[PDB]
Structure 1
Amino acid sequence: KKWLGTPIEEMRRMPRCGIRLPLLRPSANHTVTIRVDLLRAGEVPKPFPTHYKDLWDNKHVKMPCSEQNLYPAGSRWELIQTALLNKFTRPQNLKDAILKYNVAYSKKWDFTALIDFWDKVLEEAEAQHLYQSILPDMVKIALCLPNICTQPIPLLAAAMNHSITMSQEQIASLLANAFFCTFPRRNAKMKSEYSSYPDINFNRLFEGRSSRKPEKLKTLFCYFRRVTAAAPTGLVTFTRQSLEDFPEWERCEKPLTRLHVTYEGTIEENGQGMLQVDFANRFVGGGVTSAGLVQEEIRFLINPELIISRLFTEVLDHNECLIITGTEQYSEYTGYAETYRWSRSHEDGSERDDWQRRCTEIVAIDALHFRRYLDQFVPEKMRRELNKAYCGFLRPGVSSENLSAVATGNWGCGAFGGDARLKALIQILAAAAAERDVVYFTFGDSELMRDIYSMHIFLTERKLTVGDVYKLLLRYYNEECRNCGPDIKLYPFIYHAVES
């Protein structure tokens, strides 16, 4: 009674189900920032090219170490170096350092949470370790950026189908810069450039008095402590995927696939090696660098390499997703939102693939935010969610036998107002169209587990196709929502319509 349906042991997982990876190589649609010819297990990857190369334009990340990063003109990189190469002994020292190259935000950025964490949460020995060891080591890896990220990083802009593969070490240098708020043109509230990109600098983690900010900082300093002490050796791939041809859902003759549904476990622990869904905001990462702390933000905190997607990933349009392969888990946690707490450091035991990427694949798909509950049953909105999930699950050019199951849950069903029973069925239909099985976590809701299982077995036993089910959703809208909360609920309607 803890789980229902297909045993999870029968679901496909990476690496066992994967196909031989092609040779890792840069191309028109794949940026590779390391020496592939020297990539070896257990060895820190060598950056390619050897000497720093800069691009300062509207198609690439504006690096803080660029000679074009100026301030009315002096070199901002020189200023960052002078500011950060000072001894920190009190939190005000770190605030003052960050503001030396952010003078325009000195009356706008609040540092209360950073001050409280250092002075009021940490004990004396933990504070001493922070400013004697961790922060100086973070400064050093940040300032090493021009020797580490030698190759320009393209923006993954809207409508681009493009991948970036970089080393975990390169990500660590970039995230250290984000912590010290060094990325230029990413700060103004009323900016034109980068207005369609998420925040990357960490200044909003330092503001306010929530009991959540200290837990976020503990989680991030756990990561920073680990990666400055011993450089991680693997790679991470970021792929923006934007599809043009979407199924004619009413006409899809594909059958449903297999389902495992359970009210215990988590996507990240029990969906190891599966395609793990991030319940994303259209600005990937949501409020990770500010106040948010539900499913997406938590994943971005315990696997912080996800955070760097915000440096270069434009806001997702309706037909797009972001696929990240290779991020490592550095922390364990309990709770969520107001009960979230950092638990301990985590030693990731995931195998690495032939590109030295952890066998962990996460897809960010953003559900819609519904102001009115009945809005989500409008056909245009159901099709939208179907196509979003389909884009996140589809892998053009891969046999279904080589596709892991999808590990997911009540996507968009918290603050975004989604109906769990509808969103479960939508994901089941999208997974079926993408020829993937579904592993579904209901997060303690045993009744929902039973309901999803019952509907899935009902539909499969009667051999209903994807299109058969979609037309029942359309019928539900017309008969119970269009001219209407509804008088009859969705699953009861479906049972009655089919049994009729």
Structure 2
Amino acid sequence: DKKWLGTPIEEMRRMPRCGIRLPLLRPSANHTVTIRVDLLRAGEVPKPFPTHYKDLWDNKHVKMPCSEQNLYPVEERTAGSRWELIQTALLNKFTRPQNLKDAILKYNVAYSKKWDFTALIDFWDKVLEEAEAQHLYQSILPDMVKIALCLPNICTQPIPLLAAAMNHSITMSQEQIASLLANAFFCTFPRRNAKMKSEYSSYPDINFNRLFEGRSSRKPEKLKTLFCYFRRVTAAAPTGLVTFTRQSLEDFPEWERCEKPLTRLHVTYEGTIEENGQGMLQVDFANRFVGGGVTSAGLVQEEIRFLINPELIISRLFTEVLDHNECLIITGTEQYSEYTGYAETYRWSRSHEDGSERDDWQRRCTEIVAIDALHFRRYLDQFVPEKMRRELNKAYCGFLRPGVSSENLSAVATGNWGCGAFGGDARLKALIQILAAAAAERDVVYFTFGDSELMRDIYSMHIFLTERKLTVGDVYKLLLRYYNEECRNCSTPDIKLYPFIYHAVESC
């Protein structure tokens, strides 16, 4: 009973080994760089560029909590500095969870009856042992406040929003990320709270207040994972960089006419994308709002990655909701925790010491792409040509690196994308990803997460199409025939996709 099938994993392209020498890092129209590139050195904390805080309070940039324009009404007409109120509120000793709740609410007065702190109170009072709670309020929380309040000295450059249709990159230091994330913990980002807000209505939540609500047994696990990160980065400043790239394609292939052959496949029911997919493009089965319910209740594939690699969470500050033709590529995030389980069985296990090498820009050699699958009301909706074409184009966009040659592209480490709650058919999604990877000229490493039968079926299908030398176009036309013969006229399907494919090819 083989645990993997196909091309051996050692034969698949990894990184930075099979990842081209980087050009000089520099800001440009499509690339924001928030650190001194001339001073970038291995093992040294990057220096912010510019030296002194420069503020932009407008529609194209993150509205910073430390901004002079971040004001609150006081009474007559006297507008007060919200930043000064944040400083005053957070520079108090917290001995009990109520003190933390009270501090947060001082600069979020409008949410005093709307924000529930039950999970935070229960974590501190009912989950943590006496010594763990003491360490939290005597050392972790004061160290989080200091780095949150250091924000104007750390993030001196305005952060542009990665808005819809923009092809833009942001490179920032892990230290800048820690200061920003300690702010999101203290719920200091302005204009990101109202349910009826229009300005940021198409942006994910960034303030962590939903992580403090309710009684889910999973909240202490999310909190343990995040405090593990905060304890690590406040004790010793991380020295690397992280790049966030929004990619939007205009020109999509005419799939039915794609003459490209299929690429190699490694398929396994054992292993994980983060451990066994090192040096490979790692897929995040994202929500259109990147990170999904990470700052609230979600605990599936995406949320877990965002908890163990917390630097991914800051994409929520500046990443607008993904359109059908967009993806977010994140390079350099570091893994700080290890975990067990998934969803309702998820547990934080221990601290992780990330062994990844850094590239020439001091970024950990870890590339994660966020690609959001569709949510299908009815099962058969996914076989609609427009819905199949959408999934192909989404995966293709996440996998394509325009300009880069095929021999310099690592394999894609992916799995059961859009399954469970979203209603995706694993056999169809596996084919869709195999076709998009072929069009993008990358090999596929596929994880079926315990489903041994799915591993065997994907392998048998792949070997069948490969041996018959069917192109991407040939396979896409078989998907169009399936819809037509079995799904279009279907009122209740009679025949499953893979049997249909074997029959259609073998009888032709």
TM-score normalised by structure 1 residue count: 1.00
Q: Residue 310 of structure 2 is aligned with which of 295, 304, 310?
A: 304
* Deviation by residue 1:291-347 (Cα, 9 ceiling, x = unmatched): 000000000000000000000000000000000000000000000111000000000
Query: How far off its partner does 1:200 sit?
Result: 0.1
- In structure 2, the partner of 1:404 is 410
Query: How far off its partner does 1:168 sit?
Result: 0.1
Aligned equivalents of 2:344, 2:11: Cα separation in 1: 36
For the residue of structure 2 that corresponds to 1:31, the secondary structure is strand
Aligned equivalents of 1:357, 1:214: Cα separation in 2: 30
* Deviation by residue 1:334-382 (Cα, 9 ceiling, x = unmatched): 0011100000000000000000000000000000000100000000000
Aligned equivalents of 1:275, 1:382: Cα separation in 2: 22
* Deviation by residue 1:3-24 (Cα, 9 ceiling, x = unmatched): 0000000100011001110000
Query: How far off its partner does 1:164 sit?
Result: 0.0
Structure 1: 4+ residue segments shifted above 3 A: none
Aligned equivalents of 1:316, 1:197: Cα separation in 2: 9
**Identity of aligned pairs, percent?**
100
> Is 1:133 the counterpart of 2:134 in the alignment?
no
Q: Residue 488 of structure 1 is aligned with which of 481, 485, 495?
A: 495
Aligned equivalents of 1:181, 1:401: Cα separation in 2: 45
For the residue of structure 1 that corresponds to 2:171, the secondary structure is strand
* RMSD value, Cα: 0.5
* Deviation by residue 1:19-75 (Cα, 9 ceiling, x = unmatched): 110000000000000000000000000000000000000000000000000000100
- In structure 2, the partner of 1:42 is 43
For the residue of structure 1 that corresponds to 2:413, the secondary structure is strand
* Deviation by residue 1:273-308 (Cα, 9 ceiling, x = unmatched): 100000000000000000000000000000000000
Aligned equivalents of 1:348, 1:476: Cα separation in 2: 45
For the residue of structure 1 that corresponds to 2:421, the secondary structure is coil
* Deviation by residue 1:54-108 (Cα, 9 ceiling, x = unmatched): 0000000000000000000100000000000000000000000000000000000
* Deviation by residue 1:179-234 (Cα, 9 ceiling, x = unmatched): 00000000000110000000000000000000010000000000000000000000
For the residue of structure 2 that corresponds to 1:408, the secondary structure is strand
Query: How far off its partner does 1:132 sit?
Result: 0.1
For the residue of structure 2 that corresponds to 1:97, the secondary structure is helix
Query: How far off its partner does 1:414 sit?
Result: 1.4
* Deviation by residue 1:399-434 (Cα, 9 ceiling, x = unmatched): 110000000000001110000000000000000000
Q: Structure 2: which 5+ residue stretches go unaligned? A: 74-78
Query: How far off its partner does 1:435 sit?
Result: 0.1
Q: Structure 1: which 5+ residue stretches go unaligned? A: none
Aligned equivalents of 2:449, 2:153: Cα separation in 1: 44
Larger mean Cα displacement after TM superposition, 484-493 or 299-308: 484-493
Aligned equivalents of 2:431, 2:8: Cα separation in 1: 19
- In structure 1, the partner of 2:393 is 387
Aligned equivalents of 1:366, 1:152: Cα separation in 2: 28
Aligned equivalents of 1:382, 1:19: Cα separation in 2: 33
Matched length:
500
* Deviation by residue 1:99-137 (Cα, 9 ceiling, x = unmatched): 000000000000000000000000000000000000000
Aligned equivalents of 2:497, 2:61: Cα separation in 1: 47
For the residue of structure 1 that corresponds to 2:138, the secondary structure is helix
Query: How far off its partner does 1:498 sit?
Result: 0.1
Aligned equivalents of 2:238, 2:355: Cα separation in 1: 13
